[PDB]
């Protein structure tokens, strides 16, 4: 019985930590973040949930939530504040990628070792990316889309840990900042985001076997700054801003039928959440 955890968000920055159970449709309210945050990222390592970066105002904080105790614990902060951050996990380490600090649009990347509570800088990305989506497939880390400070991006790049090097991959078919990015079945999905003119409902995926991006069925709601995760073989998108409204909608993508459906609503509409499953 794994749960979808949503941490933080915006409607000011929010402290909520809530867990959705897709099997019975219930939402459970859990211990608040010590410091409210939007534009943060969530991830899980060793069954512990981590909330990373965001804006409280730009945040360098890392905090760890233990589902077994229902408690948060502070961790070592990052080298720099990272609002609009993306995060990925490889080999039990958290990678914090991109984000912004005031006028700084980061290309820097750093890695956290939970066992010794230590961050270390690694190679910076080829492109500065705030509002970047991050996913990990076969122990490679992908940074997708974002905004470089001048141009909104359809480009994507891949980090090779054994070599501490970034390489551009095929660009998406759509410019997206603030997209939800995840991995399902050897494919990197990019859902929603902002193309510089509108929030998006389109969804595309990158097949590592073909090196090509292909559109799948669109979401019912346009959304940027959405939470996203995979649970029991399906993609879930949580909240976001549609250009007008802070959404409470949670949609769920079934890949076998290429269909989206509305499965629940968050307890209050919000954007800029961090999401993980454990
Ligand atoms: C004022 O309203 C909001 C919206 C979001 C949040 S927030 O909490 O989520 N947040 C705060 C933080 N700094 O922490 C983040 C902010 C930005 C983020 N993007 C920037 C990035 N990726 O670089 S974005 O998503 O691409 C984005 C980009 C542009 C907008 N412009 C508008 O909508 C203006 C409205 N106009 C109305 C008319 C239309 C035209 C057609 O119909 C709609 C177009 C749009 C919005 C989002 C966040 C990304 C990830 C995570 C968080 C992001 C708070 C308040």
Domain boundaries along the sequence of the chain = 4-277
Q: How far is the CA of 17 from the centre of ligand 1 (A)?
A: 21
Ligand 1 atom with minimal separation from the 152 CA = 23
**Residue 192 per-residue DSSP state:** -
**Backbone region of residue 263 per phi and psi (left: phi > 0; alpha: psi in -120 to 50; beta: other values):** alpha
The CA-atom distances, in angstroms, between 105 and each of 12, 20, 96 are 22, 33, 14
Nearest CA to ligand 1 atom 3: 241
Element (H, E) at 72: strand 71-74
Bridge partners of 52? 41, 62
State if residue 55 touches ligand 1 by the CB under 6 angstroms criterion.
yes
Nearest CA to ligand 1 atom 31: 243
State if residue 272 touches ligand 1 by the CB under 6 angstroms criterion.
yes
Torsion angle defined by CA atoms of residues 193, 125, 74 and 246, in that order, rounded to the nearest 10 degrees? -10
Bridge partners of 226? none
Q: Which long-range contacts (CB under 8 A, 24 or more apart) does 71-78 make?
A: 71/31, 72/31, 72/33, 72/34, 74/34, 75/50, 75/112, 75/114, 75/117, 76/112, 76/117, 76/118, 76/119, 77/119, 78/52, 78/53, 78/110, 78/112, 78/119
Structure's resolution in angstroms: 1.4
Going by C-alpha positions, the residue among 115, 4, 11, 15 that lies closest to residue 61 is: 15
Ligand 1 atom with minimal separation from the 243 CA = 43
Q: Give me the architecture of the 4-277 domain, per CATH.
A: 6 Propeller (2.120)
State if residue 224 touches ligand 1 by the CB under 6 angstroms criterion.
yes
Nearest CA to ligand 1 atom 37: 243
Q: Are 273 and 7 in contact (CB under 8 A)?
A: yes
Ligand 1 atom with minimal separation from the 130 CA = 23
Bridge partners of 214? 205
Q: Are 22 and 256 in contact (CB under 8 A)?
A: no
Rounded-to-integer distance, Cα 214 and Cα 62, Å: 35
Question: Residues 261, 263, 266, 272: is their CA dihedral positive or negative?
Answer: negative
- How long is the chain? 278
Burial 116-128 (b: 16+ CB within 10 A, else e): eeebeebebbebb
The CA-atom distances, in angstroms, between 151 and each of 98, 100, 148, 195, 241 are 15, 14, 6, 10, 21
State if residue 147 touches ligand 1 by the CB under 6 angstroms criterion.
yes
């Amino acid at each position: 019985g794994r749960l979808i955890y949503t941490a933080g968000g915006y409607f000011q920055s929010l402290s909520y930590l809530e867990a959705y159970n897709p099997s019975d449709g219930t939402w459970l309210r859990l211990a608040d973040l010590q410091v409210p945050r939007s534009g943060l990222a969530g991830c899980v390592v060793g069954g512990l949930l981590y909330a990373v970066g965001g804006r409280n105002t730009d945040s360098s904080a890392l905090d760890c939530y233990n589902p077994m105790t229902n408690q948060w614990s502070p961790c070592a902060p990052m080298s720099v504040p990272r609002n609009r951050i993306g995060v990925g996990v490889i080999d039990g380490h958290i990678y914090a990628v991109g984000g912004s600090h005031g006028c700084i649009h980061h290309n820097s990347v750093e890695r956290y070792e939970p066992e010794r509570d230590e961050w270390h800088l690694v190679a910076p990305m080829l492109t500065r990316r705030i509002g970047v989506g991050v996913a990990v497939l076969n122990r490679l880390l992908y940074a997708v889309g974002g905004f470089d400070g001048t141009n909104r991006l359809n480009s994507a790049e891949c980090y090779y840990p054994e070599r501490n090097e970034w390489r551009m991959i095929t660009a998406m078919n759509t410019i997206r900042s603030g997209a939800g990015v995840c991995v399902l079945h050897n494919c990197i999905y990019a859902a929603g985001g902002y193309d510089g003119q509108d929030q998006l409902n389109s969804v595309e995926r990158y097949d590592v076997e073909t090196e090509t991006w292909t559109f799948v069925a669109p979401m019912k709601h346009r959304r940027s700054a959405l939470g996203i995760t995979v649970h029991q073989g399906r993609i879930y998108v949580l909240g976001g801003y549609d250009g007008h409204t802070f959404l409470d909608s949670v949609e769920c993508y079934d890949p076998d039928t290429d269909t989206w459906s509305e499965v629940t609503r968050m307890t209050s509409g919000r954007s800029g959440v961090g999401v993980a499953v454990t």
